[PDB]
Design a protein around this ligand. Sequence first.
Ligand SMILES: C=C(c1ccccc1)[C@@]12CC[C@@H](O)[C@@H]1CC(CCCCCCCCCc1nnn[nH]1)=C2c1ccccc1
Lengths: 11, 240
Amino acid sequence: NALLRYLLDKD
Amino acid sequence: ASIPHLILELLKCEPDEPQVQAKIMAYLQQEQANRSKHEKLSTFGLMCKMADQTLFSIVEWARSSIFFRELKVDDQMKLLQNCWSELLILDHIYRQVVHGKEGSIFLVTGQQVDYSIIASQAGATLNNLMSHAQELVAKLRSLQFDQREFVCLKFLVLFSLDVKNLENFQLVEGVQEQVNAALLDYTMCNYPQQTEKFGQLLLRLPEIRAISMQAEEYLYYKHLNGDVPYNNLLIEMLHA
Ligand SMILES: C=C(c1ccccc1)[C@@]12CC[C@@H](O)[C@@H]1CC(CCCCCCCCCc1nnn[nH]1)=C2c1ccccc1
């Protein structure tokens, strides 16, 4: 899952 | 209102309910209006959009807690993929317990919808799941379910002990037992009439979990048939 990683990495 | 400090810290992460209601409703019927009369969304697609917006809100609420924020993104992912549908079902149940009348369903957009008008459009599985959800709503309202117990149940679901292959499993364990002690103290204090209210609250977690798993499997099989729209967070959730 890349979208969830992007969301959680937005910081 | 004797509230432990931990429960106050947990309440501090609650999103503004009317703000998120307005955001979701505006986004939804605007995406509707961004089509013409006969390229409009299904009711099923409307509920999928609502669940997607609520999952966005759930993510922004989860990364609002330092317990969750101090974990590495991998463990955060594992937690959320284990608990997202459970958080959704629990949020719907609490919304029904608070704002709900009976004979109607209250949505995250702030809409009172006729219950039979929705039940006549759903299949057997969705009708059974909604009936079980209304059952748990009634049983929780007979127990006077408030906001602090709801917050602690959310934090218990988010940090399940059944999640394996974690790096900071001990963090999840400690947070679990902290919330356990806090909620136990709170409910045994402010609700002395019903000695067993704590056990009654903890007993309903497997029911919400099973309803969550059934709904998640139904949505997975439906999206593998193409009934769920794309460009979604719900899709990526099921696509795992
Ligand atoms: C997990 C949910 C969800 C349900 C359906 C689609 C997407 C998400 C929610 C959770 C909160 C909102 O996000 C969702 C709204 C909701 C109420 C159910 C209304 C949908 C039935 C009508 C369409 C029939 C189409 C059909 N196709 N096949 N059968 N029926 C929910 C719900 C509440 C309790 C139990 C189960 C679902």
